[PDB]
Design a protein around this ligand. Sequence first.
Ligand SMILES: NC(=O)c1ccc[n+]([C@@H]2O[C@H](COP(=O)([O-])OP(=O)(O)OC[C@H]3O[C@@H](n4cnc5c(N)ncnc54)[C@H](O)[C@@H]3O)[C@@H](O)[C@H]2O)c1
Length: 212
Amino acid sequence: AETKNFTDLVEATKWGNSLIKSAKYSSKDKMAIYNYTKNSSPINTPLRSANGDVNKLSENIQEQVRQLDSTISKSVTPDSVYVYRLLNLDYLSSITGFTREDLHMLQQTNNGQYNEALVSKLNNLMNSRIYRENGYSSTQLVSGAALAGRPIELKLELPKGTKAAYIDSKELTAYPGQQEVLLPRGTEYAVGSVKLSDNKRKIIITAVVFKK
Ligand SMILES: NC(=O)c1ccc[n+]([C@@H]2O[C@H](COP(=O)([O-])OP(=O)(O)OC[C@H]3O[C@@H](n4cnc5c(N)ncnc54)[C@H](O)[C@@H]3O)[C@@H](O)[C@H]2O)c1
């Protein structure tokens, strides 16, 4: 079978539920997922501040991280699939070579459309490079199901069998309807390209995730 790319919410929900069923979540699993979706800053900020080094975190946070790591690893993708991580322009401050001025100019769109030259520069700066998200990665099975107004769309191809938690169920998330797929902390992805969306109103960063 070929890679999945969902545009229909019903099909996505059906596919996601299969992961939820295979997960066999306990009350402890449900609590970890829910609390993260509702208040994740206490966990991901310190993780980002010390790379993926859980050993530099306070005891309460290390326990919650080990717990959530364990919950997410309880299910894997049954098919190769694309998930979308919508991001703001601040994300680009982490890219080497893109100057403070490039961003300044980048925010100056032409009726919403982004500068093609600066996007090409991003492509040049990011292509074939492996990036790593130190916090957990909150994504959506269907692009636009959440925060659809954001500038950047990180299109991530997930290999079949990689750890991932589909959590769009009323008991798992404080924000139902975002078709959220939560990826392991430390997710690594090799950027294939950086281009303007079809309508040039978003910057699409396409990458392939390394099976986790
Ligand atoms: N972002 C999504 O696509 C998405 C999909 C699922 C659900 N929702 C919900 O949104 C809430 C928060 O999600 P979020 O995506 O804003 O969280 P986040 O942790 O990604 O927020 C960090 C913010 O800083 C920027 N950023 C992200 N990673 C960065 C990095 N490595 N370096 C520098 N800047 C970086 C982004 O522009 C982002 O707005 C959660 O409750 C989640 O369940 C979001």
